[PDB]
RNA sequence: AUCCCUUAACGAGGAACAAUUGGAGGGCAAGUCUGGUGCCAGCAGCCGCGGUAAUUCCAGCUCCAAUAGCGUAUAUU
RNA sequence: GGAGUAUGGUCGCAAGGCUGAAAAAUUGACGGAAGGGCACCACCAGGGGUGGAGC
């Protein structure tokens, strides 16, 4: 009830931080402009529900018009045998319902960020009818093939090892019937636990992007659409990279309840530039609509162009990983980590960042010239609790 | 005050039937140990398969 | 070990008796009169299911 | 002095000093942190209690009453944080004791356990133990005397056994914080032994539960009798012969 | 439900949907 | 004498033991001289 | 159905922790006998 | 190890923190990191009672172990410059 | 000045004017854990119903070695 | 040192989607008519339950 945020604007950024600091919070005037559907959306209240379930001790308040929230958060316990779950190796199921449009990655980037900061390990399951692993139109989600080898090597830069993060899809879907819609289900294990997250240092220039290779999905459709997809991609990235790799998978299709049905009819492709220096990674992608029927080649040219932007574009890490980077630079040891952003990265998403952590109370950033580098102060928080043995 | 007074029933060791209410043990969660192997139950998949 | 123990460490455990209220139903049978009751047992049946083949 | 659960203490940890009063548990064999009634002398035993949350591994100073008029040693116990949690699993063994009714073979009526078949019912299938180590499994509610079952065991269970059932109650530590606040002044919650010298009532005693000494005779048992018909029917080389 | 209680027999909080 | 005995066993799990340390030293020793 | 559902626990989680701790005493025995032998190697040839 | 007759080293993590039986060597047994040479190596506890006065990263002394799991090769002596068996029998508290 | 040598007067009953370091072994619960073709076996057990000004219990368990000294680790000879 | 038997790691293969849920036979497939054998799940002769009220 203490701290007090309006809008609807990074609200899963809102909470998580609220989570992480312990810092009870109000969001209030979710959508005051909407009359037809006002209040919170169902992927929101799902998020809501993935947060209780998760944690411990959360108190979470929604009100009657659905447009004021107050959350009291408690600790991330994660599963433990005896409050979340029956075996500590048991995933947690959830369950997100058939009216949700935003991507899963929606659901997993908060909590992968929210996750080595647990007591025991995460062994989240996400099933139901809304569950769609591809990107959305929608706020433009990042896929899982995107989510796992786009960001996940950044908490490997951070000293939480990618030798433990199961993340593992066991049907893929795209959205199907207009946004809503999805079908398949995934699990992700964090088993990484760490009590303090190192101040790392990304300064040195990330020059020679060396490498491209990326994954091109198709559900539902024809398996040739991948690799006319590859021809288009390669068309594109040929004039400026002689190694471009990418894989092909295809899936069947996934059934929802209505009496089962099929869903989530689609492809998409996921580019990621490597670059030689370091942990540094461009990442792109681009998925059909849900009804539309477009050409493959325009899909394939179409990430192809939004890849060379983003390398063009970004200095370090790119817009999409800014935010957790930050976040787990903010939760870091006392001392200043720097991060090397590009002018043009800077984004509106990453400023709200960095108003909800002002106003959270950690320290402000030093933003200096070198693209910039932005310097972080860690609060040295950590996680709260596990146990020293 | 709480901490003069009497202990419950559950928080004394040996909890006979004369000290606790009627169908007090209902109310509880308790766990403990069964003995052997329960029936299978036959349910629809076991009589498909 | 043996020396890596403490005299709080070898300190006995005293056993419980009957309650008062119950002791006119005899003692109580612990493990050690357990196995004699059973060691006696044992001994009987197996004797009597000797006869009983013979 | 040994310091009992329940019973408040101040405790110095972090910048904070508070008085709280915490629940000393043994975790058992590694597996269910049972809940003792006091600290154990010269071992390490578990503690919980209800207040600030400070990161682990940090240590601690535990104190009783600031009080200069204290003839020894006012520091009581020390120690480091663990680890911090909301609603922690601290379980006290309860255990439900009854008597035997009328005794079989194998199945022996329990009569002073429970109260009605209800609880019989709940508490079917449960594992049910005498005193003497024979184990046992609670069958089925008895209908005429209310509250009483059948319990099928192991060997024959003697009249002046005591069957208990070893149920796991969980206990859930109080709410409750004080602050040291010694520079304004602060109220200071006092231990049992100073609430009972000050409001005059005795410490709670039970003989049956006081050890004394048993009185063991020798244990002699029957001879074996033999039955007439399989004592007429056995062999000529093995027939019993008595005078 | 009975198993789910078994899971959370000591878990505190949840998301209080008033809606 | 059950004192004893239970000495005397212990006695000889140790002759056991130091037999086959003595068995095992011996043929490591002989192996390299077959080899 | 508690029944059945805590005796497959049980069994679930004994087998777990027999197989971990199975394989935690053979990896370090391993290693610690391998530096112990190798140790033993180098002084005997002084 | 060294040329040394005792080595120093950072408790890492006491593996076998979690088995069931008490005095079970692999409860008694810890995993510690020398400082001169960088290896992690496996040292014993004397006792399963005196295994809760060694916690995570304290500079323990540990020396060899002459005579469950056969081949550990060291023991743990001082644990912050006090010796371990005088803190089991409760002549001196540990510096922190 | 101290020590030394002389030296009046006090100065021993164990609950003390308070011998230690190692090793081996027995005995114990209405306690806890594990295995399984009942009562058995194993690991063990400061933790037991109550009770801390409560308890007087193996009442100070037994044996072996050195004894104002003694043990451990590594190199070893 | 040789020969067996185990135990736990490490590596290699397995581990690349004309794709998107619900035959055999010269010997085989199905019958009919006639004639046998057996049956307190048949006839025949009797007996006894349950089913009416209550637990």
Redesign the pocket.
Same mark, same amino acid.
């Given at each position: 009830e203490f701290l007090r945020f309006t809008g609807h604007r990074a609200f899963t950024q809102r909470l998580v931080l609220a989570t992480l600091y312990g810092r009870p919070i109000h969001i209030s005037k979710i959508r005051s402009s909407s009359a037809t559907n006002p209040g919170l959306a169902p992927h929101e209240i799902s998020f809501l529900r993935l947060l209780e379930s998760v944690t411990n001790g959360s108190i979470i308040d929604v009100s009657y018009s659905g447009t004021t929230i107050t959350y009291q958060p408690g600790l991330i316990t994660g599963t433990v045998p005896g409050m979340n779950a029956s075996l500590s190796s048991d995933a947690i199921e959830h369950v997100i319902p058939a009216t949700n449009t935003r991507g899963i990655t929606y659901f997993l980037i908060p909590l992968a960020l929210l996750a080595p900061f647990s007591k025991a390990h995460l062994n989240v399951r996400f099933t139901g009818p809304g569950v769609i692993t591809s990107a959305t139109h929608g706020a433009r989600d990042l896929s899982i093939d995107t989510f796992r080898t786009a960001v996940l090597p950044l908490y490997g830069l951070f000293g939480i090892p990618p030798a433990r993060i199961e993340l593992r899809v066991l049907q893929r879907s795209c959205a199907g019937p207009g946004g809503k819609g999805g079908g398949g289900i995934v699990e992700m294990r964090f088993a990484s636990q760490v009590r303090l997250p190192k101040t790392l240092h990304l300064n040195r220039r990330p020059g020679k992007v060396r490498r491209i290779r990326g994954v091109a999905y198709?559900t539902?459709?024809?398996?040739?659409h991948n690799?006319r997809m590859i021809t288009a991609a390669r068309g594109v990235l040929n004039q400026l990279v002689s190694d471009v790799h990418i894989?092909?998978?295809?899936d069947?299709?996934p059934?929802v309840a209505e009496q089962? %049905?099929?869903t989530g009819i689609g492809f998409g492709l996921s580019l990621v530039a490597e670059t030689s220096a370091e942990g540094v990674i461009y990442a792109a992608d681009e998925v059909a609509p849900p009804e539309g029927g477009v050409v493959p080649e325009d899909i394939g040219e179409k990430c192809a162009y939004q890849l060379l932007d983003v390398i063009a574009q970004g200095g370090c890490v790119m817009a999409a990983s800014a935010p957790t980077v930050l976040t787990l630079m903010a939760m870091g040891s006392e001392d200043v980590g720097r991060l090397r952003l590009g002018r043009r990265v800077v984004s509106p998403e990453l400023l709200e960042l960095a108003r909800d952590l002002k106003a959270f109370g950690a320290a402000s950033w030093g933003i200096r010239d070198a693209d910039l580098i932005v310097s972080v102060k860690g609060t040295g928080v950590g996680n709260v609790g596990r146990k020293v043995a | 005050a709480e901490l003069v007074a009497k202990?419950a029933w559950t928080?004394?060791?040996?909890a006979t039937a004369a000290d606790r209410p009627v169908n007090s043990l209902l109310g509880e969660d308790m766990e403990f140990?069964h003995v052997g192997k329960p029936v299978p139950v036959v349910t629809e998949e076991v009589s498909e398969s | 070990?043996?020396?890596?123990?403490?005299?709080?460490?070898? =300190? *006995?455990?005293?056993?419980?008796?009957?309650?008062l209220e119950?002791q006119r139903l005899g003692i109580?049978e612990?493990?050690?009169d357990?196995?004699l009751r059973?060691?006696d047992? +044992?001994k009987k049946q197996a004797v009597l299911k000797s006869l009983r083949q013979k | 002095?040994?310091?009992?659960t329940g019973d408040p203490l101040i405790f110095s940890l972090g910048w904070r000093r508070f008085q709280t009063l915490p629940i000393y548990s043994?975790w058992?064999?590694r597996?269910?942190n049972?809940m003792?009634?006091?600290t154990?002398?010269?071992?390490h035993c578990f503690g919980t209690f209800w207040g600030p949350l400070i990161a682990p591994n940090t240590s601690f100073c535990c104190f009783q009453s600031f009080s200069a008029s204290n003839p020894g040693f006012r520091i009581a116990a020390t120690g480091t944080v663990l680890s911090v949690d909301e609603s922690t699993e601290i379980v006290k063994?309860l %255990?439900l004791?009854g008597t035997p009714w009328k005794i079989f073979? $194998?199945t022996a009526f329990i009569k002073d356990m429970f109260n009605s078949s209800l609880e019989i019912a709940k508490f079917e299938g449960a594992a049910i133990?005498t005193?003497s180590?024979?184990?046992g499994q609670i069958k089925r509610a008895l209908s005429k005397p209310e509250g009483y079952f059948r319990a099928? !065991?192991?060997?024959?269970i003697l009249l002046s056994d005591?069957v208990?059932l070893?149920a796991w109650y969980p206990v859930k530590p109080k709410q409750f914080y004080n602050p040291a606040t010694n520079l304004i002044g602060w109220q200071s919650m006092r231990?049992?032994?100073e609430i009972?010298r000050a409001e005059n009532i005795?410490?709670?005693? $039970?003989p $049956?539960?006081?050890?004394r000494?048993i009185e063991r005779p020798e244990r002699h048992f029957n001879p074996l009798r033999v039955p007439k018909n399989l004592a007429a029917e056995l062999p000529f080389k093995s027939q019993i012969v008595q005078t | 439900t009975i198993l789910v209680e078994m899971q959370r027999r000591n878990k505190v909080g949840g998301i209080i949907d008033r809606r | 004498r059950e004192k004893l005995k %239970?000495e005397l066993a212990?006695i000889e799990e140790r002759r056991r033991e130091k037999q086959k340390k003595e068995k095992?030293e011996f043929?490591?020793?002989?192996?390299?001289k077959? +080899? | 159905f508690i029944r059945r559902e805590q005796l497959r626990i049980?069994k679930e989680k004994?087998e777990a922790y027999e197989?971990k701790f199975? =394989?935690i005493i053979?990896?370090i025995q391993?290693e610690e006998g391998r530096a112990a032998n190798e140790?033993?190697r180098?002084? *005997?040839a002084? | !190890?060294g040329g040394?007759?005792?080595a120093k080293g950072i408790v890492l993590e006491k593996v076998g923190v979690e088995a069931?039986?008490? $005095?079970?060597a692999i409860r008694k047994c810890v995993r510690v990191q020398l400082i001169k040479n960088g290896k992690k190596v496996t040292a014993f506890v004397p006792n399963?009672?005196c295994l809760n006065f060694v916690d995570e990263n304290d500079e323990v002394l540990?020396?060899?172990?002459?005579?469950d799991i056969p081949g550990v090769?060291? %023991?743990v002596?001082k644990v912050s410059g006090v010796?371990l068996?005088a803190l089991w029998?409760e002549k001196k508290e540990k510096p922190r």
């Open positions: 198709c539902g459709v024809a398996a040739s690799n894989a092909a998978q295809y069947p299709a059934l089962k %049905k099929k | 202990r928080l004394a060791g040996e140990d | 070990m043996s020396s890596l123990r403490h005299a709080i460490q070898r =300190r *006995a455990h005293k056993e419980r008796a009957q309650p119950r109580l612990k493990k050690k357990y196995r059973a060691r047992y +044992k | 002095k040994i310091l009992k043994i058992d064999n597996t269910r049972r003792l009634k006091y154990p002398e010269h071992m063994k %255990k004791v073979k $194998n133990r005193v180590g024979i184990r099928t !065991f192991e060997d024959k005591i208990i070893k231990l049992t032994g009972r005795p410490t709670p005693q $039970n $049956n539960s006081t050890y000494k | - | %239970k212990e095992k043929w490591e020793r002989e192996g390299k077959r +080899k | 049980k004994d197989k199975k =394989r053979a990896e391993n140790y033993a180098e002084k *005997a002084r | !190890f040394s007759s005792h069931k039986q008490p $005095n079970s399963d009672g540990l020396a060899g172990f002459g005579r090769r060291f %023991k002596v010796g068996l029998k």
